[model samples]
Target: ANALSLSNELNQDQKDLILSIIDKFALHNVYQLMIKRVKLGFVFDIAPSVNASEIALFKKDEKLSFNNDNNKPTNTLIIGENYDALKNLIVIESQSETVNYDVIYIDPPYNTESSLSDGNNLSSKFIYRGKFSRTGWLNMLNERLRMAKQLLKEDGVIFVSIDDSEQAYLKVLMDEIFGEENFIACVPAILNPSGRQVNTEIALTHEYILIYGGVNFVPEELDNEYVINKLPEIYKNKKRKNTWIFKTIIKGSSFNNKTGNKVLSSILKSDEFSTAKPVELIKLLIKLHPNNNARILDFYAGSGTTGHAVMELNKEDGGNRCYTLVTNNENNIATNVCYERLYRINNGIYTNNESNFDWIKKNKPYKSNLNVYDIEYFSTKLFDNMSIKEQYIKMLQDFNIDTEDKDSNIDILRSLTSLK
Candidate 1:
């Protein structure tokens, strides 16, 4: 009666009754141990999407699976909103004890509010931020960034593409999440070689990529093919072989590369997606981080540029690298643009760039294998572990807490480590 009647808060009698019951029973069901559970402590309005809610509660009859070499897929394309997509990835990987990623490159939306919405903005309608307020955008990226960090291998590295829109915000946020000490550099890609003369007299020609390294990262000296082959007259006089002329050591000088004009022009006869990433930029990154047997990931897999770049690099040096690309079927881009681009590349349809994209065209068709996957949220349960761990690290950073706690590290490793 006391056990039944006493509440958890007002449970003196209940405790007594439970003790009595434990004494009476040979095997007690008492749980005595408790650990201090730390949360990813940060305050922000987490806007739950209708899509996320639907996906979370969604279930289906059969679980879809794919293979790479012996039916196991080397290249993978996951079609779903990245927020929910990442969560499910952790769950499935945890179940399989799969390997973590070596490199993660994401060119997420710039949150530029779109051209149709803002007449002054030059950004196309394709660069839509989903009507997200600054805070909402931050929250969305916050969760995704948290998950991405946890999915990295011990010596992994991550690159995030951004413009003036949220670059400052993302920089500070990243400093907090990935320790300020771990910050590598912000390389400014001269995306508009022609240079767009806007904002009155200012010509906005560049976008930035922030780099962060995992534990014990290997540094590679970036080779500039352009500089080596031919130098501008002014550059030759100074004997300034360095990448570019820029600023402070702490702030770091920006590395300059021309826009993806030539590459895109060579490949796509008519470009539809204005915001599609340039393959050259991705190529440089892949070159900088040379891992023949590395696994790369792109959560915001717009036009599958990263995957295409990886395959091209492999063909260049005969390196067997692979990629996992995740993107939503928003505007049918996942189906139309991303998949079709890769399919055409593999099938040797886009024979525009013979010298540049030889690897894609050299093999007759279906040479570069890829597995297509749909993000199926086949369970009602919330998937959270590595995702939360990453958030917790950010929280620790937020609170100025010691993030080197080993117990916290174990929680992440256990979530993503593969037995094989």
Candidate 2:
């Protein structure tokens, strides 16, 4: 009676009764030492469709598994709304110890010097501050890249594609965020062989691909045909950790190549695409990195070339390298690239300029399903890691903060979500 009465004294008996329960169940229940716990640091609120981080969605869940071969990689691709797709991936990977990405290649929406919005901006709309100048471009890139960095492995890399409109500033901004030294390459990428953009203003036929790693890291060895190239010397034979520049670097200041057109050979072509990357180039980048079995990403996936490269590299070298590619689905246009590549290689169109090798597709171990309705990018999606108070009610949909414009809340939230 006394013990039962003691329990009725509200706060006084709360701990005592809880302790008694623990004491009684200490030995009988296995949970007495079940102290291993994990805390979810962030959540999704500002954006209605997506969350933090980005991951890949393969076609067959069961078919996709971590590549066991350290030398080659099975490629994965997704033709969908890249921003939301990437965020949804981040949400899943954040909750698991199994997800890790070694490289992320983002072909994000570049700030075209002109206005290009679809009223609804449905998938591409955002509360951009002002005209798309270099500064504004960097702000847009800064947030997206901040999150890309979080998704990298120790030696992981993020590659961005930009035109003259924002190239120089991008280099400065990227160097600041990724460290001045970690800048891998501000490569002049050729997208057209003979096409001219000469408008009394220098023809802008080339763009740049800015590559950087987590801690000023470059791949130890990028996987490719170069690895198979039998170099006689042991130093040259070291494919996994070697740096490769396609044209041998001339000791002097000038490199006079066949293209008498202002720059060096920055783009390699295949059968279908004139300025598309040679499968070997992508492989070399991966090989130069330390981990042979690294995960790679390409958000601005063009023609799904990267995916084919991974599969070919795996087949040729017998290594397990995985890739993540994100592209938009415009009336099955993007999907066709993946489907056609999966059906058969485009020969000179993609893989080795050599048409002899099989660009055969396999039943992917993972699944990639694109949803039309949920594809969109907004500034609000970025505020995931919030404090209870910082968690504004309107953002909570209830966005009650003191910002002059409601979009200000959206802007802040976008910033928060960018680097997570």
Candidate 3:
């Protein structure tokens, strides 16, 4: 019994030696204690934003699943404020509701401090004035990425797209949290392809995507991992069994930017949005992404560029992968955003061959147009007039914060990080 207690089924002598060694050298590994410790709980300010149990019931199953249409490909599209979606999913999953995601691609706003001239301060989790400081971004990201980890599978991967504005700092943060051993690769993507000339000593056309796996699992770092390529032959390789997918680089006009070298740069550069990224760049990203029917998330869905990429990729690859797009109403990204861009493409919203966009061959030729939903986050409820001070306080007590008083419950939520 004593030997079994020390290990699985070791001999008495071995067990005694192990116990002695643990006492002398591996002291920290012995007799761990159960204590209340504050952890970073980011996804919820108030609990029960959504009921996945009800959704599960809606799915007509003993367990709830969000994706009811499993017959189609893995390529899906979700149009909503990602934070709210994350919040509701966190609620559902925290309540033991919803399925899990495999890979997450985050192109979060990496605006430099001076660039906060956008002067927007919207706080779904908290009021983020601008770019994160050492302590500030820590909290902002800590809450979200922490929840992101919860949503990831045991061997899930997270790809964060950032620039010099926050890349170095983020590397350190991810390493500390995701386990340094899980750090996969720091991929420096050349957005310019042709490179850039730094006039102000800081012209940055290149961005970086930091990749990491969950549960301390890491993959070999490859230099040519993301070489640009397109699949010309659409047939299963068969020898590998399921799919026959191989990637190679393609240098063409559609992928690279000709904006700076354009004939009308002076007039066009003055336009509100000057630098235009071709469909090819995003197509490359889609190609580099895992071909296995995987769920792809884009927290920073700029002008639905990722969506266009999704449509193009799905049509080209003949695979089903879903996409979750998150964008705030801060800029034009939400106002005139492409909710039905694919509809206007080859399908023409209601099926028309008379259109010129070639909606069938390029965009949604294979898949149907996706369902779009606007995300309205409320302290309690989105359209509630109770958003006023006292009403908000009341709402916070019930949903936002579980504390009995008016004090900030940030500390209490900080305890949720260690929940599992």
Candidate 4:
């Protein structure tokens, strides 16, 4: 009351000035307030935003790309740090009339001590450390998720795969980022039924996929065939009901490491990646959208499993879904592991000695094209003197957009770059 009385005594201009200062302070420290809400949260430095002119752009890698079928929608593989790649995607999507992604399925690092181990230890063949200090891990994901929410359609859904190590903390963090009400489910997927012996009391048999949604989101029902076949005879034979109860438990026997290994071995050296998710698992998650033509994103695309899953699902249902996969080229994984798998799968090229060669030979190659991109920085000054048309054309060329229909392409590009 005293503060309100004091403020009332001030002139209108003076009161407005003080209110504006308060607004600025609140905006600047909003992240700190967010961190304080959860017990697991900790203070971490949030990097300053890069200027729009200086931010990294997605430059096409024509040499690495393969457009096998022009009739099919182009799938994208972005080889760069996922955080930066996501930022670029948000800028591109923001220019569009509608959000670009309907489904996002990411298999980020599990952040186990062994997985996060710096390359200093030589125990695992894959030497990159999988562990991050809890604070750093949360901060890293916090930043990317802020951008992800913007790219998602109003009804978009995201599936994040993780293990027990960080599941609890990730849940709280996601709740803060996506809101507790938007959380759909924390699915327990049996990835390793036999169970890997960890230092824990029990053998680890399962990992989790945390599902969250954008506003106006609701999950699609399971297919009738899946419900009928997976259920027991009693429930299977029951008369028609208003709705079917979808089981949350995903059995490992159907979706497991072996399936991923088989696919990887068919395309690349068998041991290239030890922890790729099964195509079946991802297909199930993507199917949750019910829109077969969904635009999918997988920023933590290890070995490009999500891309392969999208293409395979498209082939299975005759839907024209497309995917954008983002990964750093660390250890040449982008070029050698992730891109190689997609290249082979899309083009129907399989090694003779591959475990799944027989299956590969039996099916037709997926009808899809891949456009590879790398993050590159350009000086804003380069466009200073160019005409709007010239700058637009250069931007199109950089992104590998077709120049055949100049007018339509120009309209699309204009929204993104705001060219007159």
**How high is each candidate's TM-score?**
0.63, 0.52, 0.56, 0.77
The order by descending TM-score is: 4, 1, 3, 2
**Model 4, runs deviating above 4 Å:** 1-54, 112-132, 227-245, 350-359, 379-420
Off by over 4 Å in 3: 1-81, 93-98, 113-138, 197-205, 216-291, 340-342, 349-367, 376-420
User: Measured by TM-score, how close is model 2 to the native structure?
Assistant: 0.52
Q: At residue 47, give the lDDT of candidate 1.
A: 38
Compose the digit string of candidate 2's lDDT tens values, residues 166-234: 677778767756777888767664544344657576665566678786774644532233433522122
Error of 2 at 318 (Å): 2.4
Q: Residue by residue across 88-189, what tens digits does model 3's lDDT show?
A: 445433434235565676666665442234322322332342334434454456556766776776756777877686788778767756867888677655
Candidate that beats the other on lDDT, 2 or 4, i.e. the better one: 4
> Mind giving the per-residue lDDT tens digits that candidate 4 earns over 148-226?
7777888899999988878988888888778889998898888787888888667888989999988887787666765
Provide the lDDT at 51 for model 2. Answer: 35
lDDT of each: 0.57, 0.46, 0.46, 0.68
Per-residue lDDT of candidate 1, residues 200-229 (tens digit): 798887788898888777755433443333
Report how far off residue 104 is in candidate 3 (Å).
Answer: 1.1
**After TM-score superposition, what is the CA distance of residue 225 in candidate 1 from its true location, in Å?**
6.0
